[PDB]
Amino acid sequence: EIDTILSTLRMEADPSLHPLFEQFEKFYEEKLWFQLSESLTKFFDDAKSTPLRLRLYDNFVSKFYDKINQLSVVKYLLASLKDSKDFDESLKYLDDLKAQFQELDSKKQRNNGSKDHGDGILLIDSEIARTYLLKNDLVKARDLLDDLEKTLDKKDSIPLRITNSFYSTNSQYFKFKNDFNSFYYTSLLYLSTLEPSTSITLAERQQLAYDLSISALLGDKIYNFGELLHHPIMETIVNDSNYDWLFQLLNALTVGDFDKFDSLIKVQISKIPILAQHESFLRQKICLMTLIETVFVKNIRMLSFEDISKATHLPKDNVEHLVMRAISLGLLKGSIDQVNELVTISWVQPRIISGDQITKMKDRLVEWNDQVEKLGKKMEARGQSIWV
Amino acid sequence: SQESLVKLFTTNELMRWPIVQKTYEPVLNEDDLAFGGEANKHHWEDLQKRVIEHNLRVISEYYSRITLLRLNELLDLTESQTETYISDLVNQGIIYAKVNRPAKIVNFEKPKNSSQLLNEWSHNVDELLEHIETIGHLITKEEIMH
Amino acid sequence: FALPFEEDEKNSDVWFLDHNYIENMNEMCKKINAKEKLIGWYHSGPKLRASDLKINELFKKYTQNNPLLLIVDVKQQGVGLPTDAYVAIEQVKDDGTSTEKTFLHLPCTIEAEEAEEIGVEHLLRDVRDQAAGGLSIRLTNQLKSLKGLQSKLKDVVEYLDKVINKELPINHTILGKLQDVFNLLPNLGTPDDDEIDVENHDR
Amino acid sequence: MVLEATVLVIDNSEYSRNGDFPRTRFEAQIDSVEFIFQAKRNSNPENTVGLISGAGANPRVLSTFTAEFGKILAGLHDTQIEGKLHMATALQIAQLTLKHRQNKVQHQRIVAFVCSPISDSRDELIRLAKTLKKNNVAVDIINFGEIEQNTELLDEFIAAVNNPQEETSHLLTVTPGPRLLYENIASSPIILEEGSS
């Protein structure tokens, strides 16, 4: 039946891959399809470098689609059509697997009396947009993602895997335009909503980690450089040559050093020429990280111009400019007084909160608690004799 | 070219006139039926008025007071032409300022009212008390779930 | 109303509930009043637990909205909050955190129906230490009010310490609110504070 | 057994997905749940039967004691079919059901089907075995779901609960492949099973 195909793939494959094809024959036969579902997922992860993935999926998807997990038919498809260099093929097998499930729920739901197979339609749908993205038909993919989004909102429970793929797609769309900000904000949600199941490599996160870092530095609205590091994705990956100089670029911005920043940047302007054309935006971003940070940690909520001039290492002229741009962004808001040489703030936009800032916030409230307590002791002394 | 132009004018920026003029002279000024006609040379001249009114609006909001000596420099105008432009835009009722003729300051503010200031203060105190009242519930929530 | 219910102390994932009771109580209550429908469940508390999320799921099969879990302390340990209200919502939590199902605080207050009121008036025959009365009543209040706030402020201090000492999970919602606490601090020496001291003499 | 109340457990699993009786094990279980209910009614007509889910971490009460087959039948279709059995939680939730009952003249019985092996620690069922027999509760395990390729962890648990008092555990051995599940129930004790003195 399908045993003959399995045998032919096995002669053709590498000796290391020969055990996997045998496992599939024995599990189908014993009719134990939990084992069979897991064993296939392991194949498509590790032997999609070998191009014997293309004829293997075909057998399982098209003859089982109610006898294997609702997640897993979509899993074997996504791997096979990822390394594919034809977009016509990528599109094709999606229209096919989409047909099976729409057909299936006309009968199945009735006999069975339960189970919805419409969850899997939405991943297929993320993947149709995905095909469009690589083919450079970005416009088409956008519409299909907005139609996906609608379905999500009217679901009572939305499992994490379904919205994970949606965000992956959305992430890809933004980096084609090169909208750093729009990519950064979409990617955090992708990272948070990432599945407890493993079938993602170390290598994939690595590629992503380069992409997160760059967006986070060459942005203009981004004052969280350890929101990267509260995910494993950039945190645990710092031990290569490329992700040393890169980790250091992030960290220099975090504590607001200009001296350390100068040393890195000088070198990496030559190396990375994406970084050189965007050098201007980055160079001032440092001063803006010092502006928001210094008024926050201090108890006074008005800052002099001379304070900013020494810290950021700039003329007094250049300082005003910086202040006006912070009001414009929404980094800070308030009034700019040139004559009295103040910037007196009325808003602090919410920031990354590290252990040191909590310590500050906690301290300041101890003083506040003592202030209330002392006033309270006075309020008890006057009027002790009569209250009512 | 059009995209950077629209973007500049929409968002709140500080910009200087001969540098913006230098950007769009070999670009937009040579596009006919806009700026490249003859009586559209005087629609180019008009582009400047719109740039120096943009800077006046921005600076009005964010700067509560600024010296007149400074304001001149940023706008790229002479002292006389600064005062008349402030004045016209105060007749048309959009902005408000008090400009000194000795040229010490311009106070881009309409001097705030007693009642409103007090009103503004009373509300902030209610926001602090509300903020603490909500916080205490979420402390209980986190500790026990841990 | 009560329902049949058991609570096991050996494992908190075991409790009893009778489903048939909930279906039969619905029939009856529509006859008395059709403006009454199931809207969720009270729980005696005062301790909120994670297993209560799973009881929550059950109640999501009688009402379209998310069920309201109304913690009513019956032990009377709190001198305020005799109602705290929370609703289960499902959201991706920040900081590399998964999708968590969690109980978020949503504002509650006692306000009384009009038909209820009549009896509230009858049973209250006490002088009422806080009722908002005469000069006397509100001087007693003003003191009470300072010790209220001060204790509320003390919980915030303790909480913050336990985050970096005993490593409580950072809950960034709390911390965000605290940024605005520092941003709505009255600052002296501005013309606003000075006008307030003039206004004390006006009054 | 005459004068007995029974909590059925329908096993909701991904081994119930797997087909080893027609159409799958889930569709096989609808037929076998109907079998037991009627058989037991005929033998003694005071017998009355509930149904609870073997799914997720929490078993949920689909039905309480009832002798309308329609109330029990309805829950079999409604429940989600893909889950995991959790034996420990089941014994306890089943036991509460057997608490709250019309008359306690009846024997407390749990009949629990197995499609998927245990998903919990062994020793917890050993400790729970002595609590079950303390209140004279027995547990019947239908085993076709741990003799597929599994070693049978079930036998030692039946040993621990078994001890004559009034109620004694049985282990219904059911062949693991097609023969129709209902018929396998029938050939095993299910109108001649009894608690011993």
UniProtKB/Swiss-Prot annotation, chain A:
GO terms for molecular function: structural molecule activity. It comes from the Eukaryota. GO terms for biological process: proteasome assembly; proteasome-mediated ubiquitin-dependent protein catabolic process; ubiquitin-dependent protein catabolic process. Keywords: Proteasome. One of its GO terms (cellular component) is cytosol. Residues 182-350 form the PCI domain. SUPFAM superfamilies: Winged helix' DNA-binding domain. Present with 12400 molecules/cell in log phase SD medium. Belongs to the proteasome subunit S11 family. This is 26S proteasome regulatory subunit RPN9. The lineage of its organism: Eukaryota, Fungi, Dikarya, Ascomycota, Saccharomycotina. The gene is RPN9.
UniProtKB/Swiss-Prot annotation, chain B:
Signal peptide: none annotated. GO terms for cellular component: COP9 signalosome; cytoplasm; proteasome complex; proteasome regulatory particle, lid subcomplex; proteasome storage granule. Residues 1-113 form the PCI domain. It comes from the Eukaryota. GO terms for biological process: proteasome-mediated ubiquitin-dependent protein catabolic process; protein deneddylation. Coiled coil: none annotated. Keywords: Acetylation, Proteasome. N-acetylated by NAT1. Present with 5710 molecules/cell in log phase SD medium. Belongs to the proteasome subunit p55 family. Acts as a regulatory subunit of the 26S proteasome which is involved in the ATP-dependent degradation of ubiquitinated proteins. This is 26S proteasome regulatory subunit RPN5. It comes from Saccharomyces cerevisiae (strain ATCC 204508 / S288c) (Baker's yeast). The chain holds residues 295 to 440 of 445 of the full protein.
From Swiss-Prot, chain C:
The keyword Phosphoprotein applies. GO terms for biological process: proteasome-mediated ubiquitin-dependent protein catabolic process; ubiquitin-dependent protein catabolic process. GO terms for cellular component: proteasome complex; proteasome regulatory particle, lid subcomplex; proteasome storage granule. Disulfide bonds: none annotated. N-acetylated by NAT1. It comes from the Eukaryota. Keywords: Acetylation, Phosphoprotein, Proteasome. Residues 1-92 form the MPN domain. Acts as a regulatory subunit of the 26S proteasome which is involved in the ATP-dependent degradation of ubiquitinated proteins. Belongs to the peptidase M67A family. This is 26S proteasome regulatory subunit RPN8.
Curated annotation (Swiss-Prot), chain D:
Keywords: Proteasome, Ubl conjugation. Disruption phenotype: Cells are viable. Residues 5-190 form the VWFA domain. The keyword Ubl conjugation applies. Ubiquitinated, leading to its degradation. Ubiquitination is promoted by HUL5. One of its GO terms (molecular function) is K48-linked polyubiquitin modification-dependent protein binding. GO terms for biological process: proteasome assembly; proteasome-mediated ubiquitin-dependent protein catabolic process; ubiquitin-dependent protein catabolic process. One of its GO terms (cellular component) is cytosol. Coiled coil: none annotated. Multiubiquitin binding protein. Present with 17200 molecules/cell in log phase SD medium. Belongs to the proteasome subunit S5A family. The 26S proteasome is composed of a core protease, known as the 20S proteasome, capped at one or both ends by the 19S regulatory complex (RC). The RC is composed of at least 18 different subunits in two subcomplexes, the base and the lid, which form the portions proximal and distal to the 20S proteolytic core, respectively. This is 26S proteasome regulatory subunit RPN10. It comes from Saccharomyces cerevisiae (strain ATCC 204508 / S288c) (Baker's yeast). The chain holds residues 1 to 197 of 268 of the full protein.
